[PDB]
Design a protein. Structure first.
Ligand SMILES: C[N@+]12CC[C@H](CC1)[C@H](OC(=O)C(O)(c1ccccc1)c1ccccc1)C2
Ligand SMILES: C[N@+]12CC[C@H](CC1)[C@H](OC(=O)C(O)(c1ccccc1)c1ccccc1)C2
Lengths: 234, 236
């Protein structure tokens, strides 16, 4: 019957509410999982939760799938993932006037804005940055803009979304560094949920093959900036 | 390396899987080096079984081995087998002789003679296009059938075709690419359905191999990163 999906509806263009937060859930990952669910003959139900609680919610069995999850070996050990459906690259973003920060290594004893309970937040911790925890990507950039923090590490997808939405507020940023590799992103389910995993994968390959994915992708991304994943065949 | 990972392969397909010293030595290739690598990190030793392409799936089905390499992900295969996270991607090309005029797309292959390997999806696609098939033993023979005018076309992934130009460059000018699939294709290891633990393990190890530079090393050993596409990395 239902596909229970955990998400946080304040992260454009992944997952957000239409009409400036007033309307239904929308976004790339939302449109895709809605699509997956329709083909599997399921009604989708979304549960809204802060990012810091999303994995906790999946562990607690409040829902069955998470969207927009970076594949890591730690997570691979402990959860099931679909085939990757997108890829992002991590950027170090500073204000355009910033001088002292040129690499990830320079973040030590700088104030950095990150989201509580994320890998980037943990990376910031290991670097011995001074963390300021923001509720989302919009607030990270806003903290940076108003000089409350000196840097943020942010995937390319939300950062470019921000420049698209607020362009004349965009040239106030510079990219100081980027990870050498881009990162596979997939749906995450609990381990030992193999049937649902195979099903999503089946359907994702169908969505590659019939042009639906290109439509959902073009709806949200500039294929000149945002990387995708290899297709499926027949 | 005191318990075995049984791998089915055909060792006449450079640069995926082939024998060193012009076919006379140990099994080698991108897919071979990667699965060997996977197996060492899993504390297994690898055992390879060589089989003609037409028989590989049957061997996995009858339990003579546990994994096939270089397998394109298809929804039919997804329905019936387990796959790892994609570790490479190829693109299908239509290759013709450089002088060829009448072939501009896949659709033009109807009633053309085409060279393909028996028991491949491209062979079945050739069938459906109402082409006249000449069955070759491998990619080298497909290109050779084309070269000597026994066939008019072959459909070949980019990876072996470019390997061929690397090995025999002075023969490069005899071929042209008439068309390519609009999408590239994910390629993975294929296991039998039901062994989820081995699947997760390979995936774990592949992501580790992304992260420590080993994948870059194996890839650069075999491919031109300006021609051949790869898959996104992992994070941590
Ligand atoms: C590097 N890292 C590590 C943890 C996480 C995945 C990748 C994080 O990114 C995120 O903020 C989420 O992907 C997210 C983003 C928008 C909407 C919903 C969720 C997320 C966070 C924690 C758990 C799952 C997803 C940055
Ligand atoms: C695009 N496509 C579709 C059908 C098939 C899988 C991928 C074919 O490629 C192959 O010849 C094999 O991948 C192969 C190649 C070299 C060494 C070992 C195996 C293969 C053939 C049959 C069954 C599994 C793999 C081309």
């Amino acid at each position: 019957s239902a596909l229970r999906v955990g998400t946080d509806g304040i992260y454009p263009p992944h997952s957000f509410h239409a009409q400036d937060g007033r309307g239904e859930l929308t976004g790339f990952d939302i449109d895709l999982i809605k699509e997956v669910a329709h083909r599997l003959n399921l009604k989708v139900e979304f549960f809204e939760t802060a990012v810091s609680g999303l994995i906790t919610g999946l562990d607690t069995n409040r829902y069955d799938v998470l969207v927009n999850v970076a594949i890591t070996p730690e997570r691979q050990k402990k959860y099931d993932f679909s085939i990757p459906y997108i890829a992002h690259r991590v950027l170090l973003v500073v204000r355009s006037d910033q001088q002292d920060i040129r690499s990830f290594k320079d973040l030590t004893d700088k104030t950095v804005a990150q989201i509580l309970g994320t890998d980037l937040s943990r990376f910031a911790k290991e670097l011995k940055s001074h963390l300021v925890f923001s509720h989302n990507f919009e607030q990270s950039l806003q903290l940076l803009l108003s000089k409350r923090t000196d840097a943020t590490m942010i995937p390319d997808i939300p950062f470019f979304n921000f420049l698209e939405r607020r362009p004349h507020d965009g040239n106030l940023f510079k990219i100081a560094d980027r990870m050498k590799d881009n990162s596979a992103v997939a749906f995450m389910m609990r381990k030992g949920n193999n049937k649902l995993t195979r099903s999503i994968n089946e359907i994702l390959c169908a969505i590659h093959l019939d042009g639906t994915y290109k439509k959902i992708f073009d709806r949200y991304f500039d294929k000149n900036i945002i990387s995708s994943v290899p297709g499926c065949s027949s």
